[PDB]
Design a protein around this nucleic acid. Sequence first.
DNA 1: CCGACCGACGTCGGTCG
DNA 2: CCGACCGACGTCGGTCG
Lengths: 85, 85
Amino acid sequence: SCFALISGTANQVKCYRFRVKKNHRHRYENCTTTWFTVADNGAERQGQAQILITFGSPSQRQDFLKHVPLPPGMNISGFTASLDF
Amino acid sequence: SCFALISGTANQVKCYRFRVKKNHRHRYENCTTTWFTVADNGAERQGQAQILITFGSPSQRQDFLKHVPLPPGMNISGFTASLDF
DNA sequence: CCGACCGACGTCGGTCG
DNA sequence: CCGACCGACGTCGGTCG
Ligand SMILES: [Yb+3]
Ligand SMILES: [Yb+3]
Ligand SMILES: [Yb+3]
Ligand SMILES: [Yb+3]
């Protein structure tokens, strides 16, 4: 349901997960490993590294946005998703 | 906007991406590397391996569901997501 | 079409300054 | 708080039967 996508360099996003899990565990539901959108040849990737963070509620997401610092050069987008099937 | 989450074993989902990219490229927008939800200790993961597949439109997603076979023991869920910020 | 398997390599958790 | 860096290892693209 309520989630955010955080993007940066792969190393950046990995180390960010480490500290979020360590210091701000109560501010989010779950978090993912680091992923990329794949491109067309071999192991090519497109775009920046990403993690997905889910929230229990939108209030929780707001708590997160207010309290967890975002390193320079990282970006965050927030979505709400309905199950289709 | 319109997406699906496909889950299975990590090897299962990787090999599935290989064939989807190879045979059914026109049936989807983009696809991700394989990811997991992390757990609480060391490199522990929770749940099955996942890939995210995006679609250009819901009609495209329907084309995909009708034409691309899903191996036994894999699962697919479909969502629609609105940008919050 | 499927996925165990190959060797390769980049992401892994963690450290530290 | 931040992220280059460490050595480790599991996911990587690809093969094949
Ligand atoms: Yb390319
Ligand atoms: Yb655990
Ligand atoms: Yb191996
Ligand atoms: Yb290295």
